[PDB]
């Protein structure tokens, strides 16, 4: 979902 | 191992019988690899990064060996700038951050 | 401390007289902070990741305290969805990956  | 961070935490993984390099990335919820063939069913998914959102293919329950340690879990494939190993598989290999 | 990866590794940081939560990100070369009106000279920069590039302002020699561990270096400020602590500061606080 969230990938930094 | 203990990996310091003066350089990118890049490691060799094995996935679908093939060796690849991937970045150990505590800032990623998920494991996202650059465009590649994987066996089995996939489903379309959207994920977010620093630059916005992308479309990926989601493969579940994929075995991945990471620096010699076994994981089996979700692998996303799409237009990521680098192969990333995210927390979903980092946790499986018993990875922690320590300072 | 030791930070497990079951959850996003969010920690308290202090920068520019502000307390914030920030993500410890071994995948990030740089430290990128949510839009904030820091004083000081800056230079424009583009940084990328999943989803492409965002425009940011680069500030040099900024003191940042991360879980009580002091650091000082370059911070990039712009429309990131999340405050990100990259390897440039993670190395100063002695941060390692361990498995």
Give the method of determination. X-ray
Q: C1, C2, C5: which to substitute to probe chain B, counting the most B Cβ within 10 Å?
A: C5
Contact call for C82 and A3, based on CB within 8 A = no
Quote the CA–CA distance of B81 and B75 in Å, as a whole number. 15
Answer for the pair B32, B15: CB distance below 8 angstroms, yes or no: no
- List the one residue out of C91, C57, C62, C89 whose CA is nearest residue C76: C57
Domain boundaries, chain C: 1-99
CA quadruple C65, C66, C72, C75: dihedral, nearest 10:
-110
**Alpha-carbon dihedral sign for residues B31, C8, C3, C11:** positive
Contact call for C97 and B96, based on CB within 8 A = yes
Resolution of the determined structure in angstroms stands at 2.2
CA quadruple B48, B53, B57, B61: dihedral, nearest 10:
0
- Residues from chain A that touch B28, judged by Cβ atoms under 8 A, are 2-4
Give the CATH number of domain C1-99; options: 2.70.160.11, 2.60.40.10, 2.40.70.10, 1.20.210.10.
2.40.70.10
Question: What residues form DSSP beta bridges with C19?
Answer: C14
Locate the chain C residue with the closest alpha carbon to B89: C5
C32 Cα distance to chain centroid:
5
User: What distances in angstroms separate CA B51 from CA A1, B46, B82, C53, one per listed residue?
Assistant: 13, 13, 14, 5
CA quadruple B99, C35, C45, B52: dihedral, nearest 10:
90
Sheet arrangement for strand C2-3: B2-3, C96-98, B96-98, C2-3
> In the structure encoding, which two tokens stand for residue C2, read together?
């030791």
């Amino acid at each position: 979902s969230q990938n930094y | 191992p203990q990996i310091t961070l003066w350089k990118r935490p890049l490691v060799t993984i094995r996935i679908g019988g093939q060796l690849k390099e991937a970045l150990l990335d505590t800032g990623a919820d998920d494991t996202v690899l650059e465009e590649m063939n994987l066996p089995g069913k996939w489903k379309p998914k959207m994920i977010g990064g620093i630059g916005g959102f992308i479309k990926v293919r989601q493969y579940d329950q994929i075995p991945v060996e990471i620096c010699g340690h076994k994981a089996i879990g979700t692998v996303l494939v799409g237009p990521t700038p680098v192969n990333i190993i995210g927390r979903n598989l980092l946790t499986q290999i018993g990875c922690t951050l320590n300072f």
